[PDB]
A = this chain, B = another copy of it.
């Protein structure tokens, strides 16, 4: 019974591919900042909140599925949506939040505090705080710079320490003081470069799929990860200018340790890829995708690995993470990238627990 003995709050991550409810217990320090944060309940549902029809009945069914069986009810709730809602204009988002408001009113258990769409810059800030909280690097001044990448379905975030730079948009910088230390971060979010959204530009690229994979417009896969990666790079850099925006800031503000969350954790953890110590390199990721998926015969590979719904996309995703990290951000292909094990349930929502007290 942790909430009779500690502060508890519920935070919902309403992401593009699904929603995750977390209930956290915590204590606070002499400034009322959260410490000893523990997840006491987790429930994840699909699909994305923004993908459902915005009406009375659909929203009731969704929230009921997300929330009903939660072992404790009478606590404060934060519902924060990310890139799936950001694909919609505010006028269309309002329908969702109007219905969501009404639902929390028909019940007297949950105490809805806020429900809104957060910007990609806020999501990146919470990404950094959540990871660094878990690493225990917040309470003392660090010798080393820790960067975080979050690989989502409709957006990707990157976030790292950088002193205030009045040449760069205020939207891409954040200054916080936490646990008595002053931290300055660069934040950026690329909407359209998440997994789902970017995949929709390459479904008819034979280099991006296993041999003989049936592409939608009737051609056959003929995988080749270096080729697929160059196609993805054109979207990263010719369209979004990822390189031009990010590389000069990392040159001048190098990151010593990189951590990633989001889909890359699942792929790295899957039966198809082999990585030690919950870390990878981009070079090993591209070579493994090239040999274990791109250059395999699809029907054979599909039969060997029956229980993985993302299997058909692994040539593409391997290629895409390499294009993003190496050709986009400029990270060296042999640089270690730590990824958080998916079983740990780490998303940015611990960031909300902390930042609201700051």
Instruction: Map CB proximity to B onto A305-328 as digits: 1 under 8 Å, 0 otherwise.
Output: 000010011000000000000000
Complex-state Cα separation, A216 to B91, whole angstroms = 12
Known: A51-B51, A235-B239, A309-B91. A189 touches B217 (CB 8 A): yes
Contact residues in B for A90 (Cβ distance below 8 Å): 214
Taking the closest CB of chain B, its distance from the CB of A192, in whole angstroms, is: 4
Contact residues in B for A197 (Cβ distance below 8 Å): 197, 200-201
A238 touches B238 (CB 8 A): yes
Known: A171-B217, A191-B217, A216-B191. A239 touches B119 (CB 8 A): no
Complex-state Cα separation, A53 to B86, whole angstroms = 21
Residue of B nearest to A201 (CB): B192
Which of B89, B201, B309, B313 is A239 in contact with, Cβ under 8 Å?
B201
Complex-state Cα separation, A234 to B119, whole angstroms = 25
Interface members, chain A 127-181 (any B CB < 8 Å): 154, 169, 171
Known: A53-B47, A239-B235. A218 touches B119 (CB 8 A): yes
Residue of B nearest to A87 (CB): B200
Contact residues in B for A235 (Cβ distance below 8 Å): 201, 235, 239
Complex-state Cα separation, A201 to B198, whole angstroms = 8
Most buried by B among A53, A121, A171: A53
Tell me, yes or no, whether A212 is within 8 Å of chain B by CB: no
B189 touches A200 (CB 8 A): no
Tell me, yes or no, whether A240 is within 8 Å of chain B by CB: yes
Interface members, chain A 231-251 (any B CB < 8 Å): 231, 234-235, 238-240
Contact residues in B for A313 (Cβ distance below 8 Å): 89
Residue of B nearest to A237 (CB): B238
Known: A200-B154, A200-B192. A89 touches B312 (CB 8 A): yes
Contact residues in B for A91 (Cβ distance below 8 Å): 309, 312
A203 touches B171 (CB 8 A): no
Complex-state Cα separation, A86 to B214, whole angstroms = 11
Complex-state Cα separation, A52 to B90, whole angstroms = 22
